[PDB]
Write a protein that binds this ligand. Structure first.
Ligand SMILES: CC(C)(COP(=O)(O)OP(=O)(O)OC[C@H]1O[C@@H](n2cnc3c(N)ncnc32)[C@H](O)[C@@H]1OP(=O)(O)O)[C@@H](O)C(=O)NCCC(=O)NCCSC(=O)CCCC(=O)O
Ligand SMILES: CC(C)(COP(=O)(O)OP(=O)(O)OC[C@H]1O[C@@H](n2cnc3c(N)ncnc32)[C@H](O)[C@@H]1OP(=O)(O)O)[C@@H](O)C(=O)NCCC(=O)NCCSC(=O)CCCC(=O)O
Ligand SMILES: CC(C)(COP(=O)(O)OP(=O)(O)OC[C@H]1O[C@@H](n2cnc3c(N)ncnc32)[C@H](O)[C@@H]1OP(=O)(O)O)[C@@H](O)C(=O)NCCC(=O)NCCSC(=O)CCCC(=O)O
Ligand SMILES: CC(C)(COP(=O)(O)OP(=O)(O)OC[C@H]1O[C@@H](n2cnc3c(N)ncnc32)[C@H](O)[C@@H]1OP(=O)(O)O)[C@@H](O)C(=O)NCCC(=O)NCCSC(=O)CCCC(=O)O
Ligand SMILES: CC(C)(COP(=O)(O)OP(=O)(O)OC[C@H]1O[C@@H](n2cnc3c(N)ncnc32)[C@H](O)[C@@H]1OP(=O)(O)O)[C@@H](O)C(=O)NCCC(=O)NCCSC(=O)CCCC(=O)O
Ligand SMILES: CC(C)(COP(=O)(O)OP(=O)(O)OC[C@H]1O[C@@H](n2cnc3c(N)ncnc32)[C@H](O)[C@@H]1OP(=O)(O)O)[C@@H](O)C(=O)NCCC(=O)NCCSC(=O)CCCC(=O)O
Ligand SMILES: CC(C)(COP(=O)(O)OP(=O)(O)OC[C@H]1O[C@@H](n2cnc3c(N)ncnc32)[C@H](O)[C@@H]1OP(=O)(O)O)[C@@H](O)C(=O)NCCC(=O)NCCSC(=O)CCCC(=O)O
Ligand SMILES: CC(C)(COP(=O)(O)OP(=O)(O)OC[C@H]1O[C@@H](n2cnc3c(N)ncnc32)[C@H](O)[C@@H]1OP(=O)(O)O)[C@@H](O)C(=O)NCCC(=O)NCCSC(=O)CCCC(=O)O
Lengths: 161, 163, 161, 162, 161, 163, 163, 162
């Protein structure tokens, strides 16, 4: 149906049910993390979420945490619901997220990828060469140990969307 | 007895809480004799200081005074004590665990603190470590420094329940 | 006509408004390979300021910059003097005002990237390739460009009056 | 006669206003190479406060400072004692008061610059050329007087200074 | 490419950037017009502008000024950006402007056209025979020595879009 | 059988008037079928158009939708219709008269209308004329132009009672 | 008797003004007895119409009803009358002289009127002309063109003391 | 000395009032065969504006005008500068300022009835006898003094006059 992207968060029913929608999709695709954890982070004020909507219904999104005081943006949760993967949705999601960030003058993503995920983060432009001083992000980015930290650098000249 | 925990603090915007804070200043000062009593009470009743209080039968029997630095990304452990006839019962670790839970819920996962010789052992068993991942450039001037004490650090795991 | 220097920006005034569009035009005209949209987005960003050089109510040049007190330097984003008034010292006065403005604001370091068409002008303004600012302090704060040369300028602090 | 301290500033009283002028006077006289008006814009800046030393009604000394609590330190801007009150301990009591004041606001580091003529006083007040504080924490905030040693003082909140 | 139309003006950031986008497209497509004149009118509040928005960015517009008291509108600027011309965009912009002017009780367009623009206005149902009296438009619309005054009369009983 | 006149219009209205406006838009739309019913609708509910409604047993049977241009010194006649089973009874004249008297009481003295081939003798019999004394500069681009229709004019005497 | 001039009308009255207006409604209709009293009354009390009243000994003895059309730059003389026991004494010429002075001070420099056969003499003596300098497009429709009545104009000079 | 321009008038502030009276003097004195009553009644009329030329406090000239925004033009009513400051560009700088003022208020036509001594000046200011504004549009809104020359000036809104 109509496909739409909304950057939504907690500061309205339509947004609220979308946020439960997202928390359902993040808990279900990322089972290794307590659903109570995903709920707090999704419904936190400082966290925003880019929501992919197919016909009223959440099917995917990205939860992030902008650190404009730090120069970068932390990518917290990335899921696309199982009957919607591998149709290039995750890419469209990352690009809207990229476009959103260049419009807000922020040019580095930082995220902790799991072994299963790294291939998709490559294909979005993320590298293992972390050019940000560890002193800049340690303690702000939620430091999963074992998970693999990656960087992305945006070019505010390219239209990502 | 009945046991309750409570994050309390001197608000600039109540009386149970007041007498509760007084009781903590009395515990901290008497269990921490080389801390001047006036210095403790200044910190406790300071607004940007919170204080997890441990209450047994309405009576303060311990607690941790801490100062959050969310902009910096870590919490300063300021005081903690358990009153003398309630130590070695596990109350000290229950305070720490609860303190750890509150701090996941507030998206902070780093504890800094200075320890004398006599407290260093306790903090290791709360899973602090001498190795400090946090940049000096981030905590210096915000945490009450202590020349002559160890700087300990603790890293919390948001995927874990502590209480 | 009489020359005026003003440090302006979007405040988050009709005369300042049309001046910011004037700057957006001489910036986007003299830096022709840069997206008009991008220059406009930055000129009108509230956290960027622009030293405008005014001659007869009309914009003839200026320097778009972005200060980083928390980091001790200022990023210089755009510098252009309009064509019919270049090589008249106008560029130098703009740079010299900027230096005066920053000494008074206790920032004594400029960081800029210089393409080959512009690097000489910056050398002649007291810039060097010798970046004394720790890389620790500027990554993720200055728009890292590849293929361009990062230049530094260190100001000399002055006791006013 | 009566000696008396007050932390004065220009916010948004005739007594306080003339007190400030006296402070600009004493500062500008004891710092003769400082432009008088640069001293003026500072004393009367809202973000600057001054610890005034009044003696029998009259400004004889002071320490002008700017607090940077979001950065954990205070910048010491001007110290001075009028010349016929120097070498009496007035300078030290002015400092010790400024310390006691800052313990109470949980700022525990002083930064300042020291020319030839006053570094010895600052060392007697416990300032060191070792700067514990991150250069990343003050480089864009404090006025640099290049040619004058930057010095730091770290405060112990557990001790009385008054 | 999601195209979309909007009648906007100066009384919101994206609207501001949208007008800058418009002032740009106008200057570049109408070079003999001073850039500052174009901006002075676009950001004048009695002047509205029908922005054509391809995939988020301005790629065309008509700056017009409505004169209800006088019973007509002034067509002030017309442009479609260079890469998007001869696709129909110019005619679609006129038709939307015509519908807006039906639903607003205004059924007369006046414009001055130089020789290169006369072809386009004839195609949009403009004519050189001006039935509005000089008494009604003169000194209200900005006249142009040597440009043809072109007139258009709309049918409120027609759908134009 | 009780017949009333009311000058109504869309105030920028209660249900009786709203329903009347609709009934007027219904009637105008049927007795004028070459007029887009969406155009009739948009005009009748315009806040600067008024309508002299002929009502019988609470029911709209006819009206004259007009547009007063007091700055220009005349009124435009927009729509004129009596329902079909009430025509040729003299309703359309009483409507014109009530409208004529309405306007001299409002110090407007000129009517302008466009009349197709099939409406011209109606207006002739209500005092309208093809000879326009109003200057083209006064009305052009203020009245809705209908190319191929005859512009008609009417001059009202304020020393006359019309009703 | 003490004579007075007062520009009055029905605003949006004062019981001394309101009785003056009927005093005028009387004098106008009685001196112009072939115009319906109703038409005179409606106008005198129309609020876009003012009246310059001539008050002798408190009673009304004449006046000039007028209508200022500033947007068009002219005023219309609509009624002029002096009580019968007070004609041929200079009253109609003072009333006009005041009307003139008043309009200079309001930056209006043209008077128009449609004079009947019996008025024309008076208007000429007040410097009125049949030669109309104001284009037809400015007054037509705004002032009523009675068949058989003579448009006459008066052009005022602001550098002249009229009163 | 210091020279400033000020569009002033009576709003229906004493330094303004004394400034208007200064204008009514200067006008009345440069235009002696015009009744001073009439000059004054205009200058202080509220539908009238006056662009004042202040040199060292003192009003040395100005232009009294009347904007007819509904009719699309502005009447020039009085132009004078003091007898001992003419022929220095003052009256031309005054009109240039009046031109810019009217561009921003989108009124791009001036009309004036000139006496024979004025005509040269308005022509240097770019006035001409070829009136594009239809009679219907200005007639009666401006008094047509017999013997006076109706002149017109069209302003170009893309040119910078000041
Ligand atoms: C990976 C996504 C989010 C993307 O879904 P998508 O729409 O299918 O992506 P697409 O545009 O259609 O395809 C893009 C392209 O990415 C490549 N790719 C390589 N590895 C993978 C992979 N594991 N999954 C999905 N795609 C992957 C595929 O080949 C795709 O096609 P392509 O090769 O480009 O032609 C989705 O498949 C999903 O929800 N997976 C399960 C959740 C997950 O594992 N998320 C990653 C971790 S989230 C985070 O920020 C960290 C949490 C903490 C931690 O991990 O430690
Ligand atoms: C440390 C506490 C508060 C803990 O009391 P508790 O309820 O009895 O603890 P528990 O859970 O029952 O047992 C914990 C376990 O920790 C072990 N342990 C090893 N070393 C120590 C040690 N030094 N102190 C307390 N326990 C210690 C004990 O064997 C306990 O049993 P376990 O090993 O688990 O079988 C208590 O002993 C006390 O009141 N101590 C004196 C107050 C004190 O020194 N607190 C820490 C310093 S305050 C601060 O934040 C630092 C200020 C800056 C500076 O000091 O320089
Ligand atoms: C470069 C400026 C802004 C300076 O204009 P100006 O008024 O002529 O300066 P001036 O005081 O009269 O001349 C002083 C001196 O500058 C020297 N110079 C050396 N190289 C150049 C050069 N490439 N362009 C202009 N001047 C240059 C001239 O020889 C002059 O020599 P002199 O000292 O008089 O003997 C102007 O020419 C201009 O707008 N040029 C075209 C646009 C441009 O390339 N601007 C500089 C790039 S913007 C930038 O690098 C900021 C960051 C951009 C990014 O991040 O990518
Ligand atoms: C330095 C002060 C302010 C101190 O006043 P005081 O009453 O004499 O202090 P005290 O407690 O009685 O004496 C304590 C001790 O200070 C020692 N000392 C060593 N060197 C100096 C020195 N250069 N000046 C003053 N005292 C100095 C004296 O020997 C005393 O020693 P002691 O206590 O007996 O062991 C005074 O001498 C004075 O007013 N001097 C003139 C102004 C001045 O030098 N101010 C400090 C310059 S920094 C400033 O405020 C400007 C900004 C920085 C910049 O310009 O870059
Ligand atoms: C005129 C427009 C805006 C329209 O372009 P467009 O998107 O290509 O329109 P289209 O529907 O795709 O094609 C329309 C059709 O109109 C015909 N035509 C005749 N002359 C022209 C012409 N000069 N340019 C474009 N088309 C023109 C062409 O045959 C076009 O294709 P078609 O007939 O459908 O096969 C465009 O060409 C353009 O951007 N031109 C540059 C600026 C400009 O020419 N503006 C018009 C005058 S600005 C004004 O309103 C008055 C300012 C005062 C003054 O000039 O003095
Ligand atoms: C014309 C009216 C509205 C009036 O009808 P009514 O109630 O019967 O009036 P009445 O007092 O009994 O007068 C009947 C009298 O009018 C005469 N007559 C001469 N020509 C016509 C004519 N063309 N149509 C209707 N009647 C006409 C008849 O011979 C009758 O003779 P009579 O006066 O009784 O001796 C009615 O017949 C009707 O419903 N007509 C259908 C709609 C219509 O044509 N309305 C007039 C035009 S709408 C407009 O305002 C113009 C919009 C723009 C445009 O037209 O382009
Ligand atoms: C006209 C007036 C108002 C003037 O009477 P007044 O107070 O005596 O004025 P005055 O200063 O003493 O006379 C100055 C001079 O006016 C001359 N005059 C020349 N023709 C006439 C004339 N036809 N009627 C009255 N006076 C006339 C008299 O001869 C006087 O002496 P003069 O000949 O100059 O040596 C008076 O006669 C009167 O009230 N008459 C009855 C009403 C009347 O006819 N008023 C004239 C206005 S007509 C009107 O308002 C409706 C026309 C609108 C329309 O329906 O189209
Ligand atoms: C005309 C002005 C106002 C001009 O002020 P200014 O500073 O002297 O003029 P400027 O800037 O130096 O420009 C001088 C230049 O204008 C040329 N010019 C040609 N004819 C004349 C002329 N008749 N008067 C003044 N200048 C005249 C002179 O050759 C000068 O040559 P230039 O252009 O400098 O090379 C001045 O001379 C003056 O105050 N004159 C006395 C009052 C006067 O005549 N005012 C203008 C009449 S406006 C009016 O109300 C007339 C009656 C209108 C009505 O019927 O309501």
């Amino acid at each position: 149906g109509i496909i739409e992207f909304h950057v939504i968060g907690n500061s309205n029913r339509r947004v609220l049910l979308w946020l439960v929608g997202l928390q359902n999709v993040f808990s279900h695709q990322l089972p290794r993390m307590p659903k109570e954890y995903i709920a707090r982070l999704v419904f936190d004020p400082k966290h925003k979420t880019l929501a992919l909507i197919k016909d009223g219904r959440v099917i995917g999104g990205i939860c992030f945490r902008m650190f404009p005081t730090q120069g970068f943006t932390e990518i917290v949760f990335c899921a696309v619901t199982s009957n919607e993967q591998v149709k290039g949705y995750g890419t469209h999601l990352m690009n809207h997220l990229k476009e959103y960030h260049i419009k807000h003058n922020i040019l580095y993503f930082l995220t902790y990828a799991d072994e299963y995920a790294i291939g998709y983060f490559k294909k979005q432009g993320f590298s293992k060469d972390i050019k940000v001083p560890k002193s800049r992000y340690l303690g702000y980015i939620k430091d999963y140990e074992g998970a693999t930290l990656m960087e992305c650098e945006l070019n505010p000249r390219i239209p990502y969307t």
